[PDB]
Amino acid sequence: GSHMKQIESAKNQKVKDWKKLHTKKERTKTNTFLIEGEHLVEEALKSPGIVKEILVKDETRIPSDLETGIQCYMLSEDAFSAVTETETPQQIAAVCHMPEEKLATARKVLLIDAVQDPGNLGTMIRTADAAGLDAVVLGDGTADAFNGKTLRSAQGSHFHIPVVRRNLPSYVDELKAEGVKVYGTALQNGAPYQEIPQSESFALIVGNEGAGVDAALLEKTDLNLYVPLYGQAESLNVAVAAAILVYHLRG
Amino acid sequence: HMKQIESAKNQKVKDWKKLHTKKERTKTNTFLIEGEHLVEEALKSPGIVKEILVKDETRIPSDLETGIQCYMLSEDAFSAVTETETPQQIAAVCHMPEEKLATARKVLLIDAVQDPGNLGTMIRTADAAGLDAVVLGDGTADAFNGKTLRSAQGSHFHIPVVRRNLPSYVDELKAEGVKVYGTALQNGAPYQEIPQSESFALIVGNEGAGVDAALLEKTDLNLYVPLYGQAESLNVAVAAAILVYHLRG
């Protein structure tokens, strides 16, 4: 049989184009992004229509039973490195389409106010995915969701739920206009989460570890809730706290 | 009185360095923590800190417990001792926690979790929820490694973190009237379905295998966090946190 397509050189226009996925401009242009790692790729392959191209240095790494519309390329080490740009050695990468957005219709959403840690951000995305939320909305100041650490941390949830960027204050206004109840994560003027009833439509705002949700944003909330601290711990990890709240509201 | 240590080859420096491995910790029944936050917390629990290590005399706390021995080290010696690449101005050697458990009515049982980050998160969560203790089953990763200690943010000095054989320990808990919950789908309902009880013991397992099957047979009831969306799974610590707070009330 004929061999798979090969790309020997880092100067190849496909390679340069792939390398560009590290820029915000090319991701915005294409609504695609680059992923690395066997499990991420596997997760992507589970989601219909997500994977566009697959890159490997070795044919043994090619996943079994691939859909026919997927183009696979075998790359040289130089070419593979050029694309991935990762110290930690990788054997497979892929280019993926972002999931269908549907923001206007979203009625169960997680709003993230300026979370900087990739680990926390990834955990939040994964949790939103697990709880079956409509979308994850990132406020100004929040870290890029498509950075390698976040992608890795999210373990494939990027393939399932839309993760978009909006101005939180404006988005809240829009949500309120549509009748979605808005909850803020805060102690001040907040109630312990267990006292709160479940809601069919909701938007939960979560914030960073130090400052927390912005004060001007908290004023726009219908209600505020929190996870009570019973022991000596100063605080709960924000993603962990977010998970408890999201799942509670969801019931 | 305070002592100064100049050489990296000094026996104490070698022994402090040895604290980063589990065998030394087990042998000496002590462990090493780095950074102001961890030391501050450790200091708040009376009798825990044995030695204080600093490079600057002014970093030594103003009112330390009398039994604490202070050491001012050189930059080279300090660097030798510490595992964090990031710059630190203080380190401490602490006594390992007492294994005996005075009270065990609300506890978290961890079955073979290996990730230090997860373990740390679980410890921190247990502290926040006000549980009596965190019990580590045979096979679980060491709670006193640097990663877990950092991850827990000082929680180790707020809650007893001990080791027990889960199967035998569960029997003991049942004998005492403590209800035992298993985190699992089989015969389990969504956690929302489960009512609170005065006392509880939640068993959480690792991601690959979950709670051991033999262990699951012992439980009174099983519960889980449903996966409504397409995510493969929830992070074990995150799931544990949801269940712990649920049972806590």
Short mmCIF file of C-alpha atoms in Angstrom, two decimals:
data_model
loop_
_atom_site.label_atom_id
_atom_site.label_comp_id
_atom_site.label_asym_id
_atom_site.label_seq_id
_atom_site.Cartn_x
_atom_site.Cartn_y
_atom_site.Cartn_z
CA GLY A 1 0.00 0.00 0.00
CA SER A 2 0.98 3.66 -0.33
CA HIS A 3 2.63 5.27 2.67
CA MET A 4 1.17 8.10 4.75
CA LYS A 5 2.07 11.66 3.84
CA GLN A 6 5.38 12.78 5.16
CA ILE A 7 6.81 16.17 6.03
CA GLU A 8 10.60 16.18 6.28
CA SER A 9 11.25 19.91 6.70
CA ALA A 10 10.46 22.54 9.30
CA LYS A 11 10.19 25.07 6.47
CA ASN A 12 7.18 23.27 4.98
CA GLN A 13 4.25 25.63 4.70
CA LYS A 14 1.98 23.08 6.57
CA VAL A 15 4.54 23.09 9.44
CA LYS A 16 4.78 26.88 9.56
CA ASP A 17 1.03 27.02 9.44
CA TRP A 18 0.80 24.47 12.32
CA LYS A 19 3.39 26.37 14.37
CA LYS A 20 1.19 29.41 14.00
CA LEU A 21 -1.51 27.71 16.20
CA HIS A 22 0.61 28.91 19.10
CA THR A 23 -0.62 32.43 18.16
CA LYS A 24 -4.00 33.82 19.11
CA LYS A 25 -4.47 35.13 15.57
CA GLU A 26 -4.33 31.75 13.83
CA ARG A 27 -6.61 30.14 16.40
CA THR A 28 -9.05 32.99 15.95
CA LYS A 29 -8.77 32.74 12.15
CA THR A 30 -9.29 28.98 11.94
CA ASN A 31 -11.26 28.13 15.12
CA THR A 32 -8.71 25.34 15.53
CA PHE A 33 -6.03 24.60 18.10
CA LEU A 34 -3.11 22.24 18.68
CA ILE A 35 -3.11 19.39 21.20
CA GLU A 36 -0.39 16.96 22.24
CA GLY A 37 -0.33 13.65 24.06
CA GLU A 38 -1.87 10.25 23.42
CA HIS A 39 -4.80 10.63 25.78
CA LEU A 40 -5.78 14.13 24.62
CA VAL A 41 -5.81 12.92 21.04
CA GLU A 42 -7.83 9.88 22.05
CA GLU A 43 -10.38 12.07 23.76
CA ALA A 44 -10.57 14.29 20.73
CA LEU A 45 -11.17 11.28 18.48
CA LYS A 46 -14.15 10.27 20.67
CA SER A 47 -15.82 13.56 19.82
CA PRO A 48 -17.33 13.51 16.32
CA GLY A 49 -15.88 16.04 13.92
CA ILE A 50 -13.32 17.50 16.29
CA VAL A 51 -10.08 16.14 14.95
CA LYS A 52 -8.90 17.57 11.68
CA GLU A 53 -5.29 16.36 11.39
CA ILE A 54 -2.99 13.99 13.23
CA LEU A 55 0.77 14.27 13.51
CA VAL A 56 3.13 11.50 14.52
CA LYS A 57 6.80 10.68 14.26
CA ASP A 58 6.13 6.95 14.31
CA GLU A 59 3.43 4.83 12.67
CA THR A 60 2.96 2.71 15.80
CA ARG A 61 1.49 5.82 17.40
CA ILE A 62 -1.28 6.09 14.85
CA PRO A 63 -4.59 5.38 16.57
CA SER A 64 -6.52 2.42 15.43
CA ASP A 65 -9.87 2.62 13.62
CA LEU A 66 -9.56 6.31 12.39
CA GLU A 67 -12.30 8.15 10.52
CA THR A 68 -11.46 8.67 6.78
CA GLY A 69 -11.82 12.43 6.67
CA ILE A 70 -8.84 12.76 9.03
CA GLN A 71 -5.53 13.53 7.42
CA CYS A 72 -2.50 11.96 9.03
CA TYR A 73 1.07 13.07 8.66
CA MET A 74 4.31 11.55 9.58
CA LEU A 75 6.90 14.06 10.63
CA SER A 76 10.58 14.16 11.21
CA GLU A 77 11.89 15.04 14.62
CA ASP A 78 12.84 18.50 13.56
CA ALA A 79 9.48 19.08 12.00
CA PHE A 80 7.63 17.64 14.96
CA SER A 81 9.55 19.79 17.40
CA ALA A 82 8.93 22.85 15.35
CA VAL A 83 5.21 22.41 15.75
CA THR A 84 4.92 21.24 19.35
CA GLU A 85 7.46 23.56 21.00
CA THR A 86 7.49 21.50 24.17
CA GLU A 87 10.43 20.46 26.34
CA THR A 88 8.59 17.44 27.63
CA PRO A 89 8.96 14.91 24.61
CA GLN A 90 5.76 14.08 22.77
CA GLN A 91 4.92 11.38 20.26
CA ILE A 92 1.58 12.49 18.84
CA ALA A 93 -0.20 15.76 18.17
CA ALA A 94 -3.36 16.86 16.53
CA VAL A 95 -5.17 19.84 15.15
CA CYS A 96 -8.73 20.16 16.40
CA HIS A 97 -11.84 22.15 15.60
CA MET A 98 -13.41 23.98 18.52
CA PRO A 99 -16.90 22.77 19.52
CA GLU A 100 -20.07 24.51 18.31
CA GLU A 101 -20.50 27.67 20.41
CA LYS A 102 -24.27 28.25 20.82
CA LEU A 103 -23.78 31.06 23.37
CA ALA A 104 -27.14 32.79 22.96
CA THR A 105 -29.01 29.62 23.90
CA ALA A 106 -26.87 28.88 27.00
CA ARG A 107 -28.76 28.68 30.26
CA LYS A 108 -26.34 26.80 32.56
CA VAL A 109 -22.97 28.50 32.55
CA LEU A 110 -19.78 29.00 34.54
CA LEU A 111 -18.27 32.50 34.60
CA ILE A 112 -14.60 32.78 35.51
CA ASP A 113 -13.38 36.13 36.89
CA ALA A 114 -9.63 36.48 36.29
CA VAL A 115 -8.35 33.04 37.30
CA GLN A 116 -4.65 32.89 36.40
CA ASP A 117 -3.62 29.35 37.33
CA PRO A 118 -3.79 26.94 34.38
CA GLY A 119 -4.41 24.05 36.72
CA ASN A 120 -7.35 25.75 38.38
CA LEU A 121 -8.72 26.88 35.02
CA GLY A 122 -8.46 23.40 33.56
CA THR A 123 -10.16 21.87 36.54
CA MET A 124 -12.99 24.36 36.28
CA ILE A 125 -13.48 23.59 32.60
CA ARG A 126 -13.45 19.84 33.23
CA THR A 127 -15.93 20.19 36.04
CA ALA A 128 -18.28 22.31 33.92
CA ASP A 129 -18.10 19.64 31.26
CA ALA A 130 -18.83 16.90 33.78
CA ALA A 131 -21.83 18.77 35.24
CA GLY A 132 -23.20 19.19 31.72
CA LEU A 133 -23.11 22.97 31.62
CA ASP A 134 -23.76 24.87 28.41
CA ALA A 135 -20.59 26.95 28.33
CA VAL A 136 -17.67 28.31 30.24
CA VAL A 137 -17.21 32.05 29.92
CA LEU A 138 -13.88 33.68 30.67
CA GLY A 139 -13.71 37.25 31.90
CA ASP A 140 -11.04 39.81 31.14
CA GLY A 141 -7.85 38.82 32.90
CA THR A 142 -8.42 35.12 32.91
CA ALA A 143 -5.59 32.98 31.51
CA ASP A 144 -5.72 31.61 28.02
CA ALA A 145 -7.72 28.40 27.97
CA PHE A 146 -5.81 27.03 24.99
CA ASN A 147 -2.36 27.18 26.56
CA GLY A 148 -0.76 23.76 26.94
CA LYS A 149 -1.06 23.60 30.69
CA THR A 150 -4.78 24.27 30.63
CA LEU A 151 -5.37 21.81 27.81
CA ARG A 152 -3.52 19.16 29.73
CA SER A 153 -5.25 20.03 32.95
CA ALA A 154 -8.73 19.91 31.34
CA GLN A 155 -8.03 16.39 29.99
CA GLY A 156 -10.19 16.82 26.89
CA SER A 157 -13.07 18.89 28.06
CA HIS A 158 -12.16 21.56 25.50
CA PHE A 159 -13.53 19.08 23.00
CA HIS A 160 -16.93 19.08 24.60
CA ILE A 161 -17.89 22.45 25.94
CA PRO A 162 -17.43 25.90 24.52
CA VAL A 163 -14.89 28.02 26.38
CA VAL A 164 -15.32 31.61 25.27
CA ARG A 165 -14.19 35.11 26.22
CA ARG A 166 -16.68 37.85 27.14
CA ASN A 167 -16.84 40.96 29.28
CA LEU A 168 -18.36 39.63 32.50
CA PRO A 169 -20.26 42.75 33.55
CA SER A 170 -21.93 42.98 30.17
CA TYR A 171 -22.56 39.27 29.92
CA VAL A 172 -24.23 39.27 33.31
CA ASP A 173 -26.57 42.01 32.12
CA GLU A 174 -27.36 39.91 29.08
CA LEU A 175 -28.00 36.84 31.22
CA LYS A 176 -30.29 38.77 33.54
CA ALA A 177 -32.23 40.07 30.52
CA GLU A 178 -32.81 36.47 29.43
CA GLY A 179 -34.03 35.50 32.91
CA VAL A 180 -31.06 33.39 33.95
CA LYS A 181 -30.43 33.61 37.67
CA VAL A 182 -26.93 34.82 38.49
CA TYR A 183 -25.03 33.51 41.49
CA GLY A 184 -21.84 34.94 42.90
CA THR A 185 -19.27 33.05 44.88
CA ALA A 186 -18.75 35.12 48.02
CA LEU A 187 -19.04 35.06 51.79
CA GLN A 188 -20.11 38.65 52.20
CA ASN A 189 -23.87 38.78 51.86
CA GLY A 190 -23.78 35.15 50.96
CA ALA A 191 -25.45 32.10 52.25
CA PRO A 192 -24.05 28.63 52.76
CA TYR A 193 -24.60 26.70 49.60
CA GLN A 194 -26.75 23.94 51.17
CA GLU A 195 -29.46 26.44 52.01
CA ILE A 196 -29.82 27.36 48.33
CA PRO A 197 -32.40 25.61 46.15
CA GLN A 198 -31.55 24.02 42.81
CA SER A 199 -32.10 26.05 39.68
CA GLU A 200 -32.96 24.95 36.16
CA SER A 201 -31.13 27.90 34.65
CA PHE A 202 -28.17 29.45 36.37
CA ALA A 203 -24.93 31.27 35.95
CA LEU A 204 -22.22 30.93 38.54
CA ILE A 205 -19.43 33.40 38.90
CA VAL A 206 -16.14 32.24 40.36
CA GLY A 207 -12.99 34.15 41.09
CA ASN A 208 -9.30 33.94 41.85
CA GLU A 209 -7.72 32.80 45.09
CA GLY A 210 -6.68 36.16 46.48
CA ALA A 211 -9.07 38.92 45.51
CA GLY A 212 -12.04 36.73 44.69
CA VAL A 213 -14.85 37.89 42.44
CA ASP A 214 -14.66 41.62 41.61
CA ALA A 215 -16.81 43.77 43.89
CA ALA A 216 -18.59 45.55 41.02
CA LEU A 217 -19.48 42.16 39.57
CA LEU A 218 -20.79 40.85 42.86
CA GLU A 219 -23.23 43.74 43.01
CA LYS A 220 -24.90 42.53 39.86
CA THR A 221 -25.65 39.09 41.26
CA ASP A 222 -29.09 37.94 42.21
CA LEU A 223 -27.70 35.88 45.05
CA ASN A 224 -24.35 35.02 46.58
CA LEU A 225 -23.28 31.68 48.01
CA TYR A 226 -20.26 29.95 49.51
CA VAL A 227 -18.78 26.73 50.80
CA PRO A 228 -18.56 26.98 54.58
CA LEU A 229 -15.21 26.54 56.32
CA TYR A 230 -15.59 24.39 59.42
CA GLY A 231 -11.97 23.57 60.20
CA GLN A 232 -8.79 25.54 60.50
CA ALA A 233 -8.16 25.93 56.80
CA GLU A 234 -7.98 29.44 55.66
CA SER A 235 -9.56 28.59 52.34
CA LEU A 236 -10.62 25.95 49.92
CA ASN A 237 -9.03 25.73 46.52
CA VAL A 238 -11.15 27.83 44.19
CA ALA A 239 -11.70 25.14 41.61
CA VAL A 240 -12.72 22.70 44.30
CA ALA A 241 -15.13 25.25 45.74
CA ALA A 242 -16.47 25.96 42.26
CA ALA A 243 -17.14 22.26 41.67
CA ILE A 244 -19.15 21.95 44.82
CA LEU A 245 -21.31 24.94 43.89
CA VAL A 246 -21.82 24.00 40.24
CA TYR A 247 -22.90 20.47 41.15
CA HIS A 248 -25.13 21.73 43.90
CA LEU A 249 -27.08 24.08 41.67
CA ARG A 250 -27.31 21.44 38.99
CA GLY A 251 -28.74 18.93 41.42
CA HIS B 1 21.25 28.79 71.84
CA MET B 2 21.50 29.32 68.09
CA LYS B 3 24.12 27.45 66.07
CA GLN B 4 25.70 28.36 62.74
CA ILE B 5 26.30 25.89 59.92
CA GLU B 6 28.68 26.91 57.14
CA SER B 7 29.48 23.78 55.20
CA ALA B 8 27.19 21.87 52.88
CA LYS B 9 29.08 18.73 53.94
CA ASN B 10 28.12 19.20 57.55
CA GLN B 11 26.43 16.12 58.98
CA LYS B 12 23.26 18.02 59.92
CA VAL B 13 22.97 19.31 56.38
CA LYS B 14 23.38 15.78 55.09
CA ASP B 15 20.74 14.53 57.46
CA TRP B 16 18.32 17.39 56.65
CA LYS B 17 18.82 16.53 52.95
CA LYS B 18 18.01 12.91 53.80
CA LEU B 19 14.60 14.11 55.03
CA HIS B 20 13.42 14.38 51.43
CA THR B 21 13.28 10.56 51.16
CA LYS B 22 10.70 8.42 52.90
CA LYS B 23 13.09 6.02 54.60
CA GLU B 24 14.74 8.79 56.58
CA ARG B 25 11.38 10.16 57.60
CA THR B 26 10.30 6.84 58.79
CA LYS B 27 13.52 6.25 60.64
CA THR B 28 13.62 9.53 62.43
CA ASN B 29 9.85 10.05 62.66
CA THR B 30 10.36 13.59 61.41
CA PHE B 31 9.95 15.59 58.25
CA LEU B 32 11.04 18.80 56.55
CA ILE B 33 8.92 21.76 55.45
CA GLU B 34 10.02 24.82 53.54
CA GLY B 35 8.65 28.33 53.29
CA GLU B 36 7.17 30.92 55.61
CA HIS B 37 3.55 29.85 55.17
CA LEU B 38 4.17 26.23 56.08
CA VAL B 39 6.42 27.15 58.99
CA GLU B 40 3.94 29.72 60.27
CA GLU B 41 1.21 27.09 60.37
CA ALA B 42 3.45 24.53 61.95
CA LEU B 43 4.37 26.99 64.64
CA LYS B 44 0.71 27.48 65.50
CA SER B 45 0.46 23.83 66.49
CA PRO B 46 2.35 23.60 69.79
CA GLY B 47 5.17 21.07 70.03
CA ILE B 48 5.43 20.20 66.37
CA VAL B 49 8.46 22.10 65.16
CA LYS B 50 11.74 20.71 66.35
CA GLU B 51 14.25 22.85 64.44
CA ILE B 52 14.17 26.16 62.64
CA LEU B 53 16.51 26.79 59.72
CA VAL B 54 17.19 30.29 58.38
CA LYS B 55 19.88 32.19 56.53
CA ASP B 56 19.11 35.45 58.32
CA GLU B 57 18.95 35.86 62.07
CA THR B 58 16.10 38.36 61.74
CA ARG B 59 13.86 35.74 60.14
CA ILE B 60 13.73 33.76 63.34
CA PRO B 61 10.27 34.18 64.93
CA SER B 62 10.16 36.51 67.91
CA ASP B 63 8.52 34.16 70.40
CA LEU B 64 9.48 30.59 69.62
CA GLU B 65 8.78 27.73 71.98
CA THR B 66 11.76 27.17 74.20
CA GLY B 67 12.56 23.70 73.03
CA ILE B 68 13.03 24.76 69.44
CA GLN B 69 16.63 24.76 68.19
CA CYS B 70 17.56 27.35 65.67
CA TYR B 71 20.22 27.13 62.98
CA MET B 72 21.57 29.90 60.85
CA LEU B 73 22.96 28.44 57.69
CA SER B 74 25.05 29.71 54.86
CA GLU B 75 23.59 30.14 51.42
CA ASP B 76 25.29 27.04 50.19
CA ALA B 77 24.15 25.01 53.14
CA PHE B 78 20.60 26.30 52.92
CA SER B 79 20.42 25.52 49.21
CA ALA B 80 21.62 21.99 49.91
CA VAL B 81 18.82 21.35 52.31
CA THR B 82 15.92 22.66 50.21
CA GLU B 83 14.02 20.99 47.30
CA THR B 84 12.19 23.95 46.01
CA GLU B 85 13.96 25.82 43.30
CA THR B 86 12.08 28.98 44.27
CA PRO B 87 13.83 31.19 46.84
CA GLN B 88 12.90 30.54 50.47
CA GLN B 89 14.02 32.22 53.67
CA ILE B 90 12.99 29.61 56.21
CA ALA B 91 12.63 25.86 56.71
CA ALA B 92 11.68 23.67 59.63
CA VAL B 93 11.97 20.11 60.82
CA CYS B 94 8.78 18.78 62.37
CA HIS B 95 7.80 15.76 64.36
CA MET B 96 5.59 13.27 62.56
CA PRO B 97 2.00 13.18 63.77
CA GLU B 98 0.81 10.76 66.42
CA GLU B 99 -0.57 7.59 64.78
CA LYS B 100 -3.18 6.87 67.46
CA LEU B 101 -6.57 8.43 66.78
CA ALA B 102 -8.39 9.85 69.78
CA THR B 103 -11.61 10.43 67.83
CA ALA B 104 -12.86 9.06 64.52
CA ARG B 105 -16.48 9.96 63.86
CA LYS B 106 -16.14 11.89 60.55
CA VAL B 107 -13.30 10.57 58.51
CA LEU B 108 -11.94 10.36 55.01
CA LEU B 109 -10.43 7.08 53.94
CA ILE B 110 -8.12 7.25 50.96
CA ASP B 111 -7.54 4.09 48.98
CA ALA B 112 -4.34 3.89 46.96
CA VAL B 113 -4.29 7.44 45.64
CA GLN B 114 -0.85 8.15 44.18
CA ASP B 115 -0.89 11.61 42.96
CA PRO B 116 0.61 13.98 45.50
CA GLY B 117 -1.40 16.90 44.25
CA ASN B 118 -4.64 14.97 44.65
CA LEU B 119 -3.62 13.77 48.06
CA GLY B 120 -2.81 17.25 49.13
CA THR B 121 -6.09 18.56 47.91
CA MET B 122 -7.94 15.88 49.77
CA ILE B 123 -6.11 16.73 53.00
CA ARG B 124 -6.84 20.41 52.62
CA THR B 125 -10.48 19.67 51.89
CA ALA B 126 -10.82 17.42 54.89
CA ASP B 127 -9.39 20.15 57.07
CA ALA B 128 -11.82 22.70 55.65
CA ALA B 129 -14.78 20.42 56.17
CA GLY B 130 -13.74 19.88 59.77
CA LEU B 131 -13.28 16.13 59.62
CA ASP B 132 -11.75 14.17 62.47
CA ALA B 133 -8.97 12.58 60.44
CA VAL B 134 -7.65 11.53 57.09
CA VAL B 135 -6.75 7.85 56.90
CA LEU B 136 -4.39 6.57 54.24
CA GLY B 137 -4.84 3.00 53.05
CA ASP B 138 -1.99 0.66 52.18
CA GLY B 139 -0.58 1.65 48.84
CA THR B 140 -1.45 5.32 49.04
CA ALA B 141 1.30 7.81 48.29
CA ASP B 142 3.32 9.34 51.08
CA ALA B 143 1.57 12.35 52.59
CA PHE B 144 4.80 13.85 53.71
CA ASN B 145 6.52 14.36 50.43
CA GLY B 146 7.25 17.89 49.37
CA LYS B 147 4.56 18.05 46.74
CA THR B 148 1.74 16.96 49.03
CA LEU B 149 2.93 19.26 51.81
CA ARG B 150 2.92 22.19 49.44
CA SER B 151 -0.41 21.20 47.99
CA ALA B 152 -2.09 20.94 51.37
CA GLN B 153 -1.04 24.43 52.37
CA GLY B 154 -0.45 23.66 56.00
CA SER B 155 -3.38 21.37 56.54
CA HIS B 156 -1.19 18.61 57.86
CA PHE B 157 -0.91 20.61 61.12
CA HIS B 158 -4.70 21.03 61.34
CA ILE B 159 -5.94 17.49 60.95
CA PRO B 160 -4.55 14.06 61.85
CA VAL B 161 -3.22 12.32 58.73
CA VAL B 162 -2.52 8.71 59.59
CA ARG B 163 -2.11 5.31 58.02
CA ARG B 164 -4.28 2.26 58.51
CA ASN B 165 -5.11 -0.94 56.71
CA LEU B 166 -8.45 -0.01 55.16
CA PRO B 167 -10.13 -3.45 55.36
CA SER B 168 -9.33 -3.87 59.05
CA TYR B 169 -9.94 -0.18 59.81
CA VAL B 170 -13.39 -0.29 58.23
CA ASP B 171 -14.27 -3.23 60.46
CA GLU B 172 -13.22 -1.16 63.43
CA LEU B 173 -15.29 1.75 62.29
CA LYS B 174 -18.36 -0.36 61.78
CA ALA B 175 -17.91 -1.87 65.22
CA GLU B 176 -18.09 1.65 66.60
CA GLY B 177 -21.30 2.48 64.80
CA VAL B 178 -19.77 4.65 62.18
CA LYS B 179 -21.54 4.47 58.81
CA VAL B 180 -19.21 3.63 55.95
CA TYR B 181 -19.74 5.09 52.48
CA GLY B 182 -18.07 3.96 49.29
CA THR B 183 -17.56 6.26 46.35
CA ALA B 184 -18.95 4.16 43.47
CA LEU B 185 -21.66 3.59 40.86
CA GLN B 186 -22.44 -0.01 41.76
CA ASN B 187 -25.51 -0.05 44.07
CA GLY B 188 -24.91 3.64 44.56
CA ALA B 189 -27.15 6.57 44.15
CA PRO B 190 -26.37 10.12 43.16
CA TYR B 191 -25.03 11.84 46.24
CA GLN B 192 -28.02 14.17 46.33
CA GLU B 193 -30.14 11.07 47.06
CA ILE B 194 -28.22 10.36 50.26
CA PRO B 195 -29.22 11.95 53.60
CA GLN B 196 -26.74 13.04 56.23
CA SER B 197 -25.80 10.98 59.14
CA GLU B 198 -24.17 12.01 62.42
CA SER B 199 -21.05 10.05 61.73
CA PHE B 200 -19.49 8.96 58.46
CA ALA B 201 -16.48 7.43 56.84
CA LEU B 202 -16.04 8.07 53.13
CA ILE B 203 -13.80 5.80 51.11
CA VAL B 204 -12.29 7.34 48.01
CA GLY B 205 -10.19 5.44 45.50
CA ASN B 206 -7.71 6.19 42.76
CA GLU B 207 -8.83 7.07 39.25
CA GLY B 208 -7.72 3.90 37.52
CA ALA B 209 -9.39 1.32 39.71
CA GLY B 210 -11.61 3.24 42.10
CA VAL B 211 -12.31 1.80 45.50
CA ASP B 212 -11.06 -1.77 45.82
CA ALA B 213 -13.82 -4.31 45.18
CA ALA B 214 -13.17 -6.15 48.43
CA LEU B 215 -13.36 -2.82 50.22
CA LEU B 216 -16.61 -1.91 48.45
CA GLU B 217 -18.32 -5.04 49.78
CA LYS B 218 -17.76 -3.79 53.35
CA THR B 219 -19.53 -0.45 52.89
CA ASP B 220 -22.96 0.29 54.20
CA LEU B 221 -23.94 2.46 51.27
CA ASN B 222 -22.46 3.70 48.02
CA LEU B 223 -22.71 7.06 46.32
CA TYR B 224 -21.31 8.95 43.36
CA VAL B 225 -21.11 12.24 41.54
CA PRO B 226 -22.98 11.86 38.25
CA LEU B 227 -21.40 12.72 34.95
CA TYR B 228 -24.03 14.66 33.09
CA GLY B 229 -21.71 15.92 30.37
CA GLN B 230 -19.17 14.29 28.13
CA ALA B 231 -16.19 14.43 30.42
CA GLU B 232 -14.47 11.15 30.88
CA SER B 233 -14.30 11.61 34.62
CA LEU B 234 -14.08 14.10 37.38
CA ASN B 235 -10.75 14.59 39.13
CA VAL B 236 -10.82 12.25 42.18
CA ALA B 237 -10.06 15.03 44.63
CA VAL B 238 -12.77 17.18 43.22
CA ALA B 239 -15.26 14.36 43.46
CA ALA B 240 -14.12 13.61 46.96
CA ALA B 241 -14.64 17.21 47.95
CA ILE B 242 -18.20 17.17 46.67
CA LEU B 243 -19.01 14.02 48.63
CA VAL B 244 -17.24 15.18 51.80
CA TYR B 245 -19.10 18.46 51.95
CA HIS B 246 -22.33 16.67 51.13
CA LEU B 247 -21.94 14.25 54.01
CA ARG B 248 -20.64 16.99 56.30
CA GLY B 249 -23.72 19.17 55.90
#
